[PDB]
Every structure is written in structure tokens, then in C-alpha cells.
């Protein structure tokens, strides 16, 4: 709250400084940061996951995507907005599936960051990559709920397997988004078989 205000101000300063660095419009950037913050905050609140720690992770996601946008030739404001929308999708999936585990949520956010960073390196669209990462989480989460899997270890291991397949695709020069989506479908098949 007083922490939420301070966190928002930290994000605004980050997004604006990055826009200034590359000559993107700073008034647009300030507005984008503010709107990105509110999007994240409201999504987390609705999902019952608005701990300071989850909000910090969401803001770190936005920060890292924005910093890599400055290095890789992406519009700063659009990058911030896309990162925020990706978190919102994670929060929505968590809500729908009843996920509140801090370790699971941290892994889901890390997966988005990794898939988006890869896309930025390669010159691909941020939103498309973020959609693939968030959808992989959604498919896992929904499969776990459907199967009655309550274990945080099982869900962490599912997301780690997605991360492992994404990393392998990076080492080998294969499609990261396809790796993520295939890994999630493999988990879904196993969850359904279980229950």
C-alpha cells in the first residue's frame, strides 16, 4: 500500500529512464508504467495473490522486459504493456485453477521472462512469445485442477520441465514457443491419465 505506492514509483522511474535512453516518448512511458502497474495490481488482487512478493515479481518482469527492449530495439511503452498483460494472464489462470503457491507463481513468471527475453534476442514479437509462455502455464494449471493435483512439487516440476525444454531449444536453435507448448501438452496428457 505505502509499499504499493513506492513500488509503482520504482516502476515508473525505470520505464521512463529506459524510454529517455533511446528517445522514446517519456510522457507515454510514464502513463504506460502507471497503467501497467494498475493492471498487475488489480489482476493479483482478484486472484488473491497480491502479496508484496508477487507484486515485486510482476514489476521485476516488466522491468526486465523493458530493459531488454532498450537493448534489442523494441518500443519501451509497448514492451511494458505486453509484460503486464502477460502477468495478468498468469494471474487469471491461477485464479481459475485455485493456485496460490508462491513457488509455483515465481516459476510461472520466470518462464515468461525467459521466453520473452529469447524472443527479444531473436527479433520476434513480445506479445506472441508472452502468449506462448502464459498459455503453457494455463494449460498446466487447468490440467492440475481438473486432475485434483494439489501438490506444489508436482506443479513446480511441471513448470521446470517447460523451462528445461525451452532451454534445450535455445541451445539447439529450435522454436522456443513450440517447445513450451509441447511440454505443457505432455503434462496435460499425464495429468488426465492420472485423473
DSSP symbols for 73-134? T--HHHHHHHHHHHHHHHHHHHHHHT---HHHHHHHHHHHHHHHHHHHHHT--HHHHHHHHH
Q: Is 5 exposed, middle or buried (0-12, 13-18, 19+ CB in 10 A)?
A: exposed
- Chain centroid, CA 153 distance in Å: 20
Cell matching residue 133: 509462455
Report the domain count for the chain: 1
- Distance from C-alpha of 61 to C-alpha of 70, rounded to nearest angstrom: 14
Resolution attained, angstroms: 1.2
SS3 content of the chain, % helix, strand, coil (to 5): 85, 0, 15
Q: Tell me the residue range of the domain where 36 lies.
A: 2-194
Angle subtended by helix axes 2-22 and 76-97, to nearest 10: 140
Amino acid at each position: 500500500s505505502s509499499e504499493k505506492e513506492e513500488l509503482r514509483e520504482r516502476l515508473v522511474k525505470i520505464v521512463v529512464e529506459n524510454a529517455k535512453r533511446k528517445g522514446d516518448d517519456t510522457e507515454e512511458a510514464r502513463e504506460a508504467a502507471r497503467e501497467a502497474f494498475e493492471l498487475v495490481r488489480e489482476a493479483a488482487e482478484r486472484a488473491g495473490i497480491d502479496s508484496s512478493e508477487v507484486l515485486e515479481l510482476a514489476i521485476r518482469l516488466i522491468k526486465e522486459v523493458v530493459e531488454n527492449a532498450q537493448r534489442e530495439g523494441y518500443d519501451i511503452s509497448e514492451a511494458a504493456r505486453a509484460a503486464a498483460e502477460a502477468f495478468k494472464r498468469v494471474a487469471e489462470a491461477a485464479k481459475r485453477a485455485g493456485i496460490t503457491s508462491s513457488e509455483v507463481l515465481e516459476l510461472a513468471i520466470r518462464l515468461i521472462k525467459e521466453v520473452v527475453e529469447n524472443a527479444q534476442r531473436e527479433g520476434y514479437d513480445i506479445s506472441e512469445a508472452a502468449r506462448a509462455a502464459a498459455e503453457a502455464f494455463k494449460r498446466v494449471a487447468e490440467a492440475a485442477k481438473r486432475a485434483g493435483i494439489t501438490s506444489s512439487e508436482t506443479l513446480k516440476r511441471a513448470i521446470e520441465e517447460i523451462r528445461k525444454r525451452v532451454e534445450e531449444a535455445q541451445r539447439e536453435g529450435n522454436d522456443i514457443s513450440e517447445a513450451a507448448r509441447q511440454a505443457a501438452e505432455e503434462f496435460r496428457k499425464k495429468a488426465e491419465e492420472l485423473k
